[PDB]
């Protein structure tokens, strides 16, 4: 086990360093100025760490949600928080809000969605999926409404491209904004590492074992949704991550969550970074990373399924 974690936490660094060797004013042979040094500290490094934490975050969210719903085909989008956040950001863009206004709006409707799912939940697992499905429909329709009634000259293109998400405009201000919730949520979730195994228990056994299913599920849903809301706030809509990463991780360290969470976080971080510095390499222009996670993810998903 430790041998696997140490290995994954190795690629993470190796790929991070190698990242410095891509783009304008980069490196080429230095196995680890004055311009290079500034490009690294103010531009490159910020994006590298942002991809790493966002990859770890979306993967984390995917794996814990898969445990809650006892289904490997679940992703951090079934609770409808991604659509809620997408709408929050879209709305902020539509009214020409400020950067901080976008963050608050994105998180506000992101948490707001979780709250709605909770309220309608109290007024089963399948039911949460249905409720979140309803909210996603509502939010994606409102998003469509806004872009339809928005100026096609400047307003529209902004809404459209933000919904694609990328790390092209990542900076130290955003990284630190997301990093706080990220470190918070990931810590609690990691401390509940073992208890997550109890999410697979059935009602009767859970009660006998003193497991408080309801409170536990919601604590995880909230932390899981908080990560995604904050992630969307600083990088837009990114998909096809939480689905395949936990699977690859279970191929490496097994099903016990106590070992799965840390492993999925590490594999997710490296995977996102690899994809992000491909969005740069691939072309002269910045292709939104959402296009790449889908073009890489989907086929990879097939390959992973193919090998039953």
């Amino acid at each position: 086990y430790p041998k696997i974690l140490f290995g994954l936490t190795l690629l993470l660094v190796i790929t991070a360093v190698i990242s410095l060797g891509i783009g304008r004013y980069s490196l080429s042979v230095p196995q680890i100025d004055p311009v290079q040094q500034q490009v690294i500290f103010q531009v490159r490094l910020p994006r590298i760490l942002t991809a790493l934490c966002v990859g770890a975050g979306l993967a984390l969210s995917g794996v814990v949600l898969q445990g809650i719903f006892r289904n490997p085909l679940v992703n951090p989008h079934i609770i409808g928080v991604t659509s809620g956040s997408a709408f929050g950001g879209t709305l902020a863009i539509f009214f020409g809000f400020s950067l901080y206004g976008l963050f608050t709006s994105t998180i506000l409707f992101g948490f707001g969605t979780l709250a709605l799912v909770f309220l309608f939940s109290f007024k089963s697992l399948l039911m949460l999926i249905l409720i979140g499905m309803i909210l996603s429909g509502l939010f994606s329709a409102l998003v469509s409404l806004l872009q339809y009634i928005s100026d096609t000259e400047e307003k529209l293109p902004s809404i459209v491209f933000w919904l694609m998400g990328s790390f092209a405009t990542s900076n130290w201000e955003k990284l630190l904004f997301f990093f706080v919730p990220f470190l918070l949520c990931s810590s609690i979730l990691l401390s509940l590492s073992w208890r997550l195994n109890l999410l697979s228990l059935d009602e009767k056994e859970a009660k006998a074992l003193g497991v408080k299913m309801a409170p536990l599920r919601w604590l995880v849903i909230f932390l899981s949704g908080s990560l995604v809301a904050c992630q969307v706030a600083i990088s837009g809509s990114i998909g096809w991550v939480g689905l395949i990463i936990p699977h690859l991780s279970r191929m490496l360290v097994g099903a016990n969550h106590q070992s799965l969470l840390p492993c999925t976080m590490l594999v997710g971080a490296t995977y996102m970074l690899l994809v992000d510095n491909v969005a740069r390499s691939l072309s002269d222009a910045e292709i939104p990373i959402s296009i790449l996670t889908a073009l890489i993810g989907a086929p990879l998903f097939g390959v992973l399924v193919y090998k039953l």
Partner: peptide, 8 residues
């Protein structure tokens, strides 16, 4: 005990 996960 039914679970899609390969618990030991």
């Amino acid at each position: 005990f039914s679970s899609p996960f390969a618990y030991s």
